[PDB]
Paper text:
We also obtained two cryo-EM 3D reconstitutions of LptB2FGC at resolutions of 3.26 Å and 3.61 Å, respectively. These two structures were assigned as LptB2FGC-I and LptB2FGC-II. Structure alignment of these two structures gives rise to a root mean square deviation (RMSD) of 1.2 Å over 1324 Cα atoms and indicates the main difference between these two cryo-EM structures is in the β-jellyroll structures. These regions appear to perform a rigid body rotation motion toward the outer leaflet of IM, similarly to what we observed for LptB2FG. The TMD and NBD domains of LptB2FGC are similar to those of the LptB2FG structures and represent the resting state. In our LptB2FGC structures, the periplasmic β-jellyroll of LptC was clearly resolved and found to form a trimeric interface: LptC and LptF form the primary LPS transfer path, while a loop from LptG (residues 209–215) binds onto the N-terminal β-jellyroll of LptC (residues 60–69). Intriguingly, in contrast to previously documented LptB2FGC structures, the transmembrane helix of LptC remained unobservable in these maps, indicating its flexibility and a lack of engagement with LptF and LptG at Interface 1. This, in turn, results in an unobstructed entry point for LPS into the TMD cavity. Similar to LptB2FG, we identified four lipids in the transmembrane region of the form I conformation, which likely originate from nanodisc reconstitution. However, for LptB2FGC-II, the lower resolution and particle counts in this conformation prevented confident lipid identification.
Numbering used by the authors:
A (entry chain G): 1 to 354
B (entry chain C): 47 to 176
C (entry chain A), D (entry chain B): 2 to 240
E (entry chain F): 1 to 362
Write the structure that this text describes.
Amino acid sequence: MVKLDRYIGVTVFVAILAVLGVILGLALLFAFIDELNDISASYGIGDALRFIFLTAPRRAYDMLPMAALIGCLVGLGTLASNSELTIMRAAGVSLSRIVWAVMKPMLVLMLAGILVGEYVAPWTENIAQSGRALAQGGGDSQSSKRGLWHRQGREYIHINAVQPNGVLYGVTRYRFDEQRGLESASFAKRARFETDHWQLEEVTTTLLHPREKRSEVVKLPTERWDAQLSPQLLNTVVMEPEALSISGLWQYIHYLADQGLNNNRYWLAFWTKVLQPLVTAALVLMAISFIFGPLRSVTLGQRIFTGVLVGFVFRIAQDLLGPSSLVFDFPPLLAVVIPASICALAGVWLLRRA
Amino acid sequence: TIDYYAENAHSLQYQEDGSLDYEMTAVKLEHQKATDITFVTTPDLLLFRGNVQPWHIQSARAEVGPKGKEVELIDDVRVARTDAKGQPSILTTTRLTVFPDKNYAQTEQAVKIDAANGVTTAVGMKAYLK
Amino acid sequence: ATLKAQHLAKSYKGRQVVRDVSMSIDSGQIVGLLGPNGAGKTTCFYMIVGLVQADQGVVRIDEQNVTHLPMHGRARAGIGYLPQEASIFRKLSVSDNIMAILETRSDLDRNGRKEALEGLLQEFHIHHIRDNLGMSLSGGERRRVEIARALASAPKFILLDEPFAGVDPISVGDIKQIIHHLKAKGIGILITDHNVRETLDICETAYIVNDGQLIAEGDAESILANDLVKEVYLGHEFR
Amino acid sequence: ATLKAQHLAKSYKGRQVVRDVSMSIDSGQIVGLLGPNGAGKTTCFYMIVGLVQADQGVVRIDEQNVTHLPMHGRARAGIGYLPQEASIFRKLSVSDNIMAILETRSDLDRNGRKEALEGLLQEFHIHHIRDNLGMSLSGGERRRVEIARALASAPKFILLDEPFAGVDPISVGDIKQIIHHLKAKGIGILITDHNVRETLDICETAYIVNDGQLIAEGDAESILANDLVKEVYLGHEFR
Amino acid sequence: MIVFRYLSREVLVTMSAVSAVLLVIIMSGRFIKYLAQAAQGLLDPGSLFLIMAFRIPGFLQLILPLGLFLGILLAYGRLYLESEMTVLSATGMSQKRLLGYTMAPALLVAILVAWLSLFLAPQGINQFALLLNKQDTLTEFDTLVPGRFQAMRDGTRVTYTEELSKDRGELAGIFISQKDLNSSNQERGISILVAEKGTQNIQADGSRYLILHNGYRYDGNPGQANYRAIQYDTYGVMLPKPEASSEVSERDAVPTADLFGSDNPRYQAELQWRLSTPLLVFVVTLLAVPLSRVNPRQGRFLKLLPAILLYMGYLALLIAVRGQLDKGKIPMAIGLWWVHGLFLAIGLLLFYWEPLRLKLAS
């Protein structure tokens, strides 16, 4: 069997590509409209367009399963409602063969999707986030949301922006005393990680000697300070848990497990990143089962409507199960497995119902 | 509602130049958020650089307006000024409202400014600091 | 080879549709299924095809019980089907339309597949339209292509639903010619249609059903002359 | 009053469907519009109804140019219509099914409305099913209720659409009798469908269109005897 | 008259079903957005039920016009598909008659949404805030990881402690940082609080009371030398209501009684926004009927997503215009009615397309 497999695969692949394109267009439009509220005469509209365009691949990978579901629905529906699946079945071809014929381009698709995600997506996400943080955080002591707080010893450190060149932007540190009386307050625009130690550029510290003596301010272009934080950790911590590579997630999970800090969120992120082929296959099987059952000879608009409704239901369910695992100590892998398991069970039941 | 309530309240406010404009000392400090008017009872207020003359303030009842709009001192407030008379000579003030912007110590009530050692009493009181 | 549907019956959501209907179709015989739209003619036809499962009764093709077998199992057994609506492959050419079905057969080899392609293409006079795509193809040529596609599977029996419905009287002659040619090879054909006259003309024996049980059977002349069928479904005015 | 259609034409995407087709239907006679499916028979019927706006030509009922007028304007002018599919009000009683249309008639009081409802209820022998819901009716009662509603609209001509499409031979007589009653009332009727025999039997005059032009017209016997329609539409073997 | 009741009943039933489904979906989405925060560091699971039960009326307000829209679309598409609408139009009723019939369910929905906008929703949100503050308790003091930095109100407030007692209060050294916006930091600088132990008290007389064992307050620009340092043993904290600020603005719970009389441009914009929903319902009803004409080729559900996106665009444009209005950039005389006029013009052109084309056909 050659020609029928090629026909079915080409039809489903083209339909899914069109659905993915439309979904990406809508998602980009909605993200841009929501994000346009942050213009501040220092972060221009062109910068917002760049950020949206550079972050597009991440949401493409994010919305790939629903796009595959909807595209497989409509495409197979076109062939069925047109009365050709009946002919293919009455020729001797079994339902399993049709399912495998649909699965083969789907195999290609999830292979490609896992590849593009795990390799490209963190890179573009890092570029976009670094650009946005650079655009926003070039302000004052602390004037940006995309910043980080950290404490070492009795010195309190804040960063306005972190860049992929190890160049922290807008760092401020307050040094205190055992009695916790303020002694110095500093702020430097830029900070560079030399191999031996961190280095500053054009610090603007001030000195407040504890007694009533003269309060002075001292400026040094290249003050030096030492800490334990590293840029390799810096780029990982600022990024969202949904944006790192699979290998990066694994390494950071091991790093957190080494020192005992809880890492359930990154466990859930790893589980939803790795198990993407399983959820995609379950959803596509459910779509195939719908096409062969109630959605036999209905209009294409009805197919699209029920597809988007089911996709919204599935996304809402799996988003509810995410934080619920953290709240109720519920093992994270279950939160990914259950919606897919329910979907696959319903699909196989309706397929067995013929 | 009392937003902030402190015991043994000591304030050290270094001015932009580096010399403390004023340094609040008090047994207690109180603040309200619903109205940012603040009550400070039983303080010992010291303003060495707030005025050219060293200033010692001993208030039985005191009150400070929102954002430092106004300073209300009640119940025979003793304020010290240093003219050629070097002694602080805490000066009794029954009730007054001091504008921190120009140190305009407007008086809401008749004030009997009497030196601790000598007699400098004045009947009535009219406030023109500007 | 004979197809025997014995004691077929089925009860739908609230009311039974078919009760104890029996049909025997032989290889080389045309049999028509006729009856009121309310009666279970379409339901029984779909049981014989296998689209709807039957609650009771056995269907066997040459001593092989195919009741449990699904539609693909029945198709591999030898039963064929054509739907009333257009069923051509739109984006695929006619030659590809026949070749896709030819690839399904396990017995035939590459040389055999090509030879069978050429034989069916020349046989039904669809040689001139091999390159043309299915969508642009006309209605009559579409019916010829569908018939050739069904025949490419080498079915022991082929079942037609509403073949004469919605067809101009000049083309029903071509339809009967194609039916006769399918007869010539030995394949038995079962026809269900709304148009009484053309079927009672074409098929040798007709089965008339009502209330889920057959009421009359025999040749067309005996079908016309029977009083029960005239009272209920034919009418006194007909013929 | 006569519904007169002159020099109608239509052009689709890049192809003209109908060229210079003229018709005349007069009150008190039945006229059949027949033709090949590919030809502009359905196009002429629809552009007479008003579903599709004619590109050229004038359609006129008693010296009123009703081409530009919408469907509601045509209905107010005197043209009725009955769709092919079921058009009975599902969740409405039969008596209410007729009253909903009777109420829109301006020239009637409440007493006259009740009297007209009773007369229409009694006329078509649908008196006893007045309380049953619209969905519950079978085929024949549904058709009778539809025609009674169309009469309740008080039209001057009713344009039937495929009355004998998928209808049992016994139930055809009821439709024929109802059309005879409508004609006897004084309402001209135009009929178009694929089943040639019955429309040729009932209609007084038949209009045949092919390639978007009126190839032949006349009484049924003349349509049967004409050479061109037999060659291209009817077939030599026909009749 | 009978057809009026028939159509009204179908529209009302379909609108009820669509409204129920949409309300379920929106409530679920808000539940995700709320449960994320409640999971990470803040809020308590016990108060979510009250929050949703008090926030529902606004969602019902924003949903009901859209629910009527689709209802109209689905019901009239179903009528067209089964040929009821054709046999109706084949009797003498026109699309103007359709609009006249449909206005009554539209009027009922307009009455309901007007009630929700004017009285129920502001009262609901006022009760939301007050009852939240009264009974609902917070967990920023109850549950913390000591080494973990806690940020409040996004970047404005950051709280950190060395160690927190599980029994709450009697903590270790605390680091409290607040950077108020609206040039308040420009006036003085950044205020930071440091204490030795601190004590948290929950009660009815005071919402949340924090008493330090020994503490300090330093306030001044990090680079500039002007500082204010306050030294003490005890200190206070009072009326902490983080969520209610993020949930709704102060203008949202303002009753409509004093809203129109006031001269604040924000309140004037809010008044126009609250009165926008009934005219929005009417415009949606006007532009819905012509769009319901569907042939069986394209089915019934084909043109539901375009309607959804059109309504979302309408709402977004309304929100943007209201924002520019309360900012004062847009003149108040023109106000908010111009977008409604534009959408009404679009709907009118859509409704009169066929008669205008026929007139152009001479």
